Design a protein around this ligand. Structure first.
Ligand SMILES: Nc1nc2c(ncn2[C@@H]2O[C@H](COP(=O)(O)OP(=O)(O)NP(=O)(O)O)[C@@H](O)[C@H]2O)c(=O)[nH]1
Ligand SMILES: Nc1nc2c(ncn2[C@@H]2O[C@H](COP(=O)(O)OP(=O)(O)NP(=O)(O)O)[C@@H](O)[C@H]2O)c(=O)[nH]1
Ligand SMILES: Nc1nc2c(ncn2[C@@H]2O[C@H](COP(=O)(O)OP(=O)(O)NP(=O)(O)O)[C@@H](O)[C@H]2O)c(=O)[nH]1
Ligand SMILES: Nc1nc2c(ncn2[C@@H]2O[C@H](COP(=O)(O)OP(=O)(O)O)[C@@H](O)[C@H]2O)c(=O)[nH]1
Ligand SMILES: Nc1nc2c(ncn2[C@@H]2O[C@H](COP(=O)(O)OP(=O)(O)O)[C@@H](O)[C@H]2O)c(=O)[nH]1
Ligand SMILES: [Mg+2]
Ligand SMILES: [Mg+2]
Ligand SMILES: [Mg+2]
Lengths: 336, 290, 290, 290, 284, 285
């Protein structure tokens, strides 16, 4: 029942989120890793200073502050008891962005299985933010934050809270939490795999252009022009360069981790993508299937139906730079 | 006031308006809940005249709520003189007193954009009377601003209250507690896949296939929006009124006319919707043009 | 006055300019969304004279929403007199009365940085009334601070409203989808590629290579700006206003002048824009300089 | 007044100063950004009399913004005379009228710590008006609290605006890119490795050996600060003021004098810059002493 | 200069620093006599025991620019512009230039210090004091009417170092203020001499310093969580023995449970054993 | 009164030792502990005269402000006047009598913001700074003729309750100036047992109930995080209904179980009805 060592997965999430030392931390499990960055990351932010958003405040005060709203005062007759309804912009840290972090820290502390040091340090920080109001977290809160007015650094740490919240399970106790066994599910791991690659390819392969391409069937049907019944087809990634175009279909499977029969059903999707796609330049068309393996990496090339197709693997668990080395080495072969 | 004038032009099924007419006589406190551009404001002016059976402005009143709207203007309150403060009868107080004169004739009060202001701040004490069961002079109460307990106000049974609320904003996910008890929510469909909306175009020199081709995509698109719950609920989906307007000249519908709407209205809206996946914008925008 | 007069100096294609009047004449309320420095403020005064057909200021009104405007400021509010308060009709209410003084001649209201203010608060009742269909006496509605005697405020048909929302500040973006249906949104591009911009430089003693080199680099940059959506979206892409001005004295455009621009204005923006790696900052600055 | 009077004590190069007055004469709006202790406040009072060419403080207005500052204070707002409220023309409004009286003479407004207060709310109407090409009566605009449309405010051409913002806090930064466009941003550096800084010390009986040891040290340290732009940008680096003042009595700057200040001021500052690294604090602190 | 438990060198630093720089921040844990130090010290700088010159306030999160400097606030008739204390105080000192007038701000960390000071955050620096540096205030009706700090004014800031708020860091204010740490001073003889001149046992005093130091050093062990700023102050021992009860082991036992025990909880939160351990360590 | 009070005399003796010196004090304990009734008898004890006039009581809430507590402007028939608050009036009453100890009771203090209410005076109530030396003019004191100082005689008691899990860590302001005291329910105390045996209660019935509640009091505090020691039930419910004229009995207790402990038991857990039912059934028999 093997899975990737937990530390390296964090690197994949980083590219997936589009943006540190993990050697120091001794906790193999993920939550020690993720909390340490969050616990440390807030400390990095606080050094520079946390975000302060001008929050308008309209209230009943004993004097003029900012702009008096004449209507609310006269209607409430606050003049008689020497009061006014006035609007002013107090500058606070109680915004949604900051509130999410603080409530998450409660979840992080409440987690049943966690390093002692991480739990202790976070509890300090939780106290260190007295003004902020705790909240009950939902994706709807994170949904509102798609504006991303905050810095690039904030958006990274916020994404971490999204992973924790959704991948938090109550455990033995009603109050405390228990972390999700994320590695076991392939589907999100696959969506991690696909998203990890797409943003990764933009970074390293500056030489080539990397875009996801939607595809349309060559078919015509008398019944419907819509062809809603037909399967929707959107590439995982397309990595187009002047010399050669290349489409990749990659998925995370448990069977392939075993070094026997081979699970390559995704290939069935791939061929039809090649067909429906027509290149104006007509330089060439190439395909690649890349999967994660644990032990070692194996590469083959094939010439199937007039298309040049590669099957390849990566030895995850080796080392992240050598893995980073291997991926760039891989594409150089096929991108030609 | 014939239904034929009322109901022929409309895109809505005759079933739902009848269902609406049922509850409105029954409960008299109703809310139309749908995205903007489906004729919520459009129907309500007609609906008032349906019930009365006549086109009468006096018996029908329309307002739009906003944050500045308050009890003191709505119901009763004090307005400054040059120095002094004079009490003034508000709309609803003045409006009901007309209804008190003629109990038989139905009276209609229409409140658009109700969610923007808290009902309690405006209505307040009168929410007790406003409910359908507790109406009539039996339940009379003296007002906050009444000079004496003798002066009293009761909501007459004849008045019906209509509220037009749009499910297009994130804040409205937490609907106000005041509304839910007292009003009956009804959902208005986008109403693309309807005969009358199509027939409206066909009378306006439209090809059926171009019309029929469009609806599946619009029906397809709104389905995609409703599938989401986190950012965009079912209530956010597109209404049917972008396409209605702009044909007053007689210019025939076509991709040329349609493309103007897509780029100038619907294209940037989708950027706001699909901020996270700009390519998703490209997916649909290219899909619609084709 | 005519289009030839206005489009003499404007860097925009005629294509949008006719599209603008097309949506306006049908819809009567529109918004131009673009980054700062693309002539949004610049076109607006010229646009007003086109529709009236004459260069008249009286029929036009120009304002800016500064996140402190209110319904009391726009429409109706209470102001202190010498000792006691009085009711003052706002500017828009003051404006509409002028527009209905003569329906024949069109009247324009211009609002800079409209996205800042909470539009739902300011307009209130008008948010429905502004739309083209619901105009005139038929849709007269009584205002909040109107006298108890029925006095109603209706948008004249001749009135046209224009909004000017920059695309930089994401937070200050219109999420009032109910309000976004009244308006039609017109994207404006930076204007680099256009010859009408290029001619403006070449007429002003410029090399075609230096001009053609400039547009090539900027267009590369805006793609890279357009590439991202996480932080820096499409809208952030750089305007042409920086290059427009400062040559009135007779200074010919050259790398010296361009170098002054890059170090002084753009180079701060870039480091503010990225704030992740200086290399990207060092890269693109040197690219423009080299 | 004359130019050389200012430059005698100024550590910044004239090259930057010449760049500055060139922009300011053109742009009329500028922003000076650097760490604290580099003479932003110092230069600004000097710079105004340079631009005017005559040492007239009446034509100079100097203010420090902060959270408790608004459009009502700055521009216009209603405030209590006593029993009766009055419209109080804010300080900037009064300043602009003074400059109108003498259009020839340049009038200068100095804003210290501008980045603190919400400029978006404060400037508002001004945010459009202030730009170099939009000044004058042609672009006159009525304000929020203006009695009628005719009452309008236009920035005079003679006015020059100065913006002063520290770069220490990323929290308080001018993220409004539209606001960024009006202002021309000129970075200011600590300028340790300058003659005029050294001449000031040698003039006050300082060892040239100690001086060369001193400037080289900080130059390396400041460069270390700029390196970790993710953590701490170049804007965070130490200014020259700590060493500047404190010798007024005539105390010679020996190594002991420097060792005293480092312990008292820079040492806790260093502790804050390196919260995680105690050795790095120990490294650089010990580096200075030997 | 007699009853002070802080080193004579440390106070000598301050007077030289204060007179020159005119601004300081005195930061330390509670119970180190920050209030008494400055109040003792303030009379030194004046040279006379004058309390009218000296004014003290204790800031708090709700404290505002309305309170400190200026503000619009109601009279019986209505609203008017009300000069806050500092405007009132600086005018009073401006009336008499020669003498040195002092302003003391306690619990300064609580308020958003930038917000409170506002205009004077620039003006307070020693060089920018005078009519040349005057500015019209925020609420000043007229541009010509301005406020400038006089040179005689000197400012003292008292800071609790045990409640860090990771909300706002200002390194510019740090330029205005010269930060001076204060240690509890258990080791100092003046602390010991006070007790031995109160009929304490010689060993009992010596025993206490060993006990406190072992605890205090542990607090400073983990600089990230806690620091020397967190460690315990001495002032709790000063109070309560001037009634006539000389020190005894029982008296020590009272204070540990009375005062320090919550602090331990505050400090060593969710670790009772460490509290029980360190508590019991002192009692033995 | 000591015999009437059910809490340990050592705590009673201990408190008088603290308050006399510290002059500021706050009591945190479960609801139903007679915290108000405790302080009053203690208030009368310290003064020694059983004087209510010296005694003044206040209950805080979130709206409670400086105008309510200290001073504010209230409307006249025409215009408005400065209107003295409770504490301003109360201390000036105490100012005349320096020898006489005057006490102030602040119930539910933790709800309100002390700073917003007290403001300036929040430091002046600290025992070190008392008397005319620390006089300050008030915010609304337009003239400098009069300054407000709390004289030494004043003692301030705050009644706080450990009932609510929603309550987060106490405000930092409170911790500084106040000594925090935990009050026991007092079931084990003989003085409470003599308060039932004086009512002809059965010793078995008396002793069983002490053991019965103690079994619960341990379990409610056994919870690590959600329900602590402060949560555990007090005795005040048991007092009212016995000396009115009706003798103790198990049926009398049986009503009390349903009345207060049963909903309270539901309130604390709010998760498991069986765990409530098991405990409620356990209490009854
Ligand atoms: N002919 C015709 N027009 C319709 C129909 N439904 C809506 N419209 C048109 O759509 C436009 C706006 O309708 P409206 O009621 O204001 O939508 P709304 O729900 O009120 N908008 P909002 O929610 O933003 O307030 C009008 O031109 C209206 O006549 C319809 O069924 N038939
Ligand atoms: N001559 C000329 N100048 C132009 C043109 N377009 C923009 N500019 C110039 O660029 C500067 C700013 O234009 P402006 O309308 O204010 O852009 P904006 O979008 O309104 N600014 P903002 O978004 O910040 O409010 C002015 O000098 C303007 O004249 C143009 O087509 N021709
Ligand atoms: N004598 C002399 N002092 C200088 C010079 N440059 C800066 N200083 C000194 O450094 C101190 C601060 O000047 P200032 O402008 O306020 O620095 P700043 O960047 O504005 N600081 P902040 O942004 O925090 O307000 C003063 O002592 C000032 O005189 C200089 O060239 N000569
Ligand atoms: N004799 C003497 N008393 C001191 C010393 N330090 C503090 N005290 C006394 O301790 C009591 C409380 O001091 P306080 O200012 O409240 O503590 P802090 O503000 O936290 O530093 C007062 O009586 C102080 O004078 C000292 O060094 N010597
Ligand atoms: N006689 C007597 N009554 C007590 C004692 N303790 C509490 N009580 C009674 O319990 C009631 C007050 O309880 P309390 O907790 O203050 O009510 P609460 O303020 O609503 O929580 C009164 O009937 C008190 O007299 C006590 O020790 N002796
Ligand atoms: Mg509507
Ligand atoms: Mg503009
Ligand atoms: Mg400065």
């Amino acid at each position: 029942q093997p899975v990737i060592p937990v530390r390296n997965i964090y690197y994949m999430l980083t590219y997936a989120w589009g943006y540190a030392n993990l050697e120091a931390i001794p906790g193999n499990n993920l939550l020690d890793i993720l909390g340490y960055v969050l616990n440390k990351g807030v400390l990095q932010l606080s050094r520079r200073g946390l975000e302060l958003d001008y929050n308008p405040n309209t209230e009943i005060i004993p004097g003029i502050k900012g702009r008096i709203e004449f209507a609310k005062t006269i209607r409430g007759f606050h003049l008689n008891h020497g009061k006014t309804v006035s609007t002013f912009d107090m500058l606070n840290e109680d915004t949604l962005a900051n509130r999410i972090i603080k409530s998450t820290l409660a979840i992080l502390i409440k987690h049943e299985k966690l390093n002692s040091t991480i739990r202790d340090e976070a509890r300090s920080l939780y106290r260190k933010l007295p003004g902020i109001s705790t909240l009950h977290l939902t994706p709807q809160h994170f949904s509102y934050l798609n504006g991303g007015k905050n810095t690039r650094y904030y958006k990274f740490v916020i994404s971490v809270c999204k992973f924790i919240v959704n991948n938090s399970i109550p455990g033995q106790n009603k109050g405390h939490y228990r972390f999700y066994d994320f590695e076991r599910n392939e589907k999100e791991m696959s969506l991690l795999y696909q998203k990890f690659l797409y943003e990764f390819c933009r970074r390293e392969l500056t030489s080539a252009n990397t875009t996801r391409s939607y595809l349309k069937w060559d078919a015509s049907s008398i019944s419907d022009q819509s062809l809603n019944l037909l399967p929707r087809m959107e590439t995982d990634i397309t990595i187009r360069s002047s010399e050669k175009i290349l489409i990749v279909d990659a998925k995370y499977y448990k069977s392939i981790f075993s070094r026997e029969k081979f699970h390559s059903q995704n290939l069935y999707q791939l061929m039809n993508y090649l067909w429906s796609l027509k290149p104006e330049n007509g330089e060439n068309i190439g395909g690649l299937l890349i999967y994660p393996h644990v032990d070692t990496a194996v590469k083959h090339r094939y010439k199937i139906n007039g298309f040049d197709i590669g099957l390849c693997t990566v030895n995850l668990g080796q080392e992240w730079p050598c893995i980073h080395q291997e991926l760039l080495d891989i594409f150089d072969e096929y991108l030609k | 006031y014939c239904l034929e004038d009322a109901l022929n032009d409309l895109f809505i099924p005759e079933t739902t308006i009848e269902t609406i007419l049922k509850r409105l006589t029954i409960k008299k406190n109703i809310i139309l809940q749908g995205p903007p551009g489906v004729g919520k404001t459009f129907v309500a002016r007609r609906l008032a005249y349906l019930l009365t059976g006549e086109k009468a402005p006096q018996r029908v009143n329309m307002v739009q709520f906003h944050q500045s709207y308050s009890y003191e203007d709505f119901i009763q309150g004090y307005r400054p003189n040059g120095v002094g403060f004079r009490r003034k009868d508000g709309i609803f107080y003045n409006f009901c007193q007309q209804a008190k004169e003629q109990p038989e004739k139905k009276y209609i009060f229409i409140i658009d954009e109700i969610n923007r202001a808290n009902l309690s701040k405006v209505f307040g004490e009168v929410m007790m009377l406003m409910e359908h069961d507790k109406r009539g002079e039996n339940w009379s109460v003296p007002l906050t601003y009444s000079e004496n307990d003798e002066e009293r106000f009761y909501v007459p049974e004849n008045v019906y209250i209509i509220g037009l609320m749009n499910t297009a904003d994130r804040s409205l996910a937490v609907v106000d507690y005041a509304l839910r008890r007292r009003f009956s929510f009804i959902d208005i469909e986008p109403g693309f896949d309807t005969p009358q909306f199509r027939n409206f175009l066909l009378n306006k020199k439209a090809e059926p296939s171009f019309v029929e081709s469009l609806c599946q995509k619009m029906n397809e698109l709104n389905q995609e929006i409703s599938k989401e719950a986190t950012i965009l609920g079912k209530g956010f989906r597109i209404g049917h009124s972008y396409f209605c307007c702009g044909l007053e000249d007689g210019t025939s519908p076509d991709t040329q006319w349609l493309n103007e709407i897509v780029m100038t209205d619907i294209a940037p809206l989708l950027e706001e919707y699909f901020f996270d996946d700009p390519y998703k914008q490209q997916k649909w925008t290219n899909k619609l043009l084709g």
